[PDB]
Write a protein that binds this DNA or RNA. Structure first.
Ligand SMILES: [Ca+2]
Ligand SMILES: [Ca+2]
Lengths: 133, 132
DNA sequence: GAGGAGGCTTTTTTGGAGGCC
DNA sequence: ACTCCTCCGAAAAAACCTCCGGA
């Protein structure tokens, strides 16, 4: 059952990068979703369409997957979560706002994580999280 | 006079990394100071002692300097500012909490910025802002 | 949900052109 | 030897009010 089998949070390696105030009124434009591989593969396209994302990437996380995305306008975390939870009503799903957007994405590119697919060829680099010059 | 001559904020390249809510009750453990070179050189040591910093670095920023530091316990920005402003009562000084600690320090190491001195040999790397 | 920022809304300034619709 | 009609739309200024949210 879920209490025994499901993760209750993101992997510990990533927690310092996230907002844990999942009910906050402070809107954001960078989010992460932790879920099953089956679900993450479907959600990748759905998120991309629903939120007209500037950028999305899907990452391996041992048996499971993580989505990382950036939106053109800001949203409450509870809004993103509600959309994601209602699409598929089986299995776990953890949704959190990302405070350290570069560090998050960058860690998701390296052991124990890796990129499965992303919406821009070559992905992102530290430069892209600096102001445009 | 100050209104004509002094910077009123950090350089624009760095603003997205900082908290602008300088009067906030929110405590933090990463701060930056923008001031003159002669003030920054003295403050480097004073900060290090007053706040028992885990790390501090002084950076060139065109004619002026920026201090970047990390503290072992959290403080209000106003507390750090109040200490810094009262030490030397001449010239400008801008103090702000840092939201994007790695991006801030990393940008302070590259053109147009550079490291003048720092409290650990070799400084910091992205690995250091990940969990141990 | 304070209080500042910035934007929608409204008023004031402005000046080209009217003359029995 | 030197300051006057009016109407109405556009544009500029000012006022106010919504938005985000102790970031
Ligand atoms: Ca001073
Ligand atoms: Ca709040």
């Amino acid at each position: 059952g879920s209490k025994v089998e499901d993760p209750k949070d993101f992997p510990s390696e990533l927690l310092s990068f996230l907002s844990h105030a999942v009910f906050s009124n402070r809107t954001l434009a960078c989010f992460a979703i932790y879920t099953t591989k089956e679900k993450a593969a479907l959600l990748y396209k759905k998120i991309m369409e629903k939120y007209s994302v500037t950028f999305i990437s899907r990452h391996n996380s041992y048996n499971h997957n993580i989505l990382f995305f950036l939106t053109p306008h800001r949203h409450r975390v509870s809004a993103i979560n509600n959309y994601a939870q209602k699409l598929c009503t089986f299995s776990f799903l953890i949704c959190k706002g990302v405070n350290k957007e570069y560090l998050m994405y960058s860690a998701l590119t390296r052991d124990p994580f890796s990129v499965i697919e992303e919406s821009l060829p070559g992905g992102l680099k530290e430069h892209d999280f600096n102001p445009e010059s």
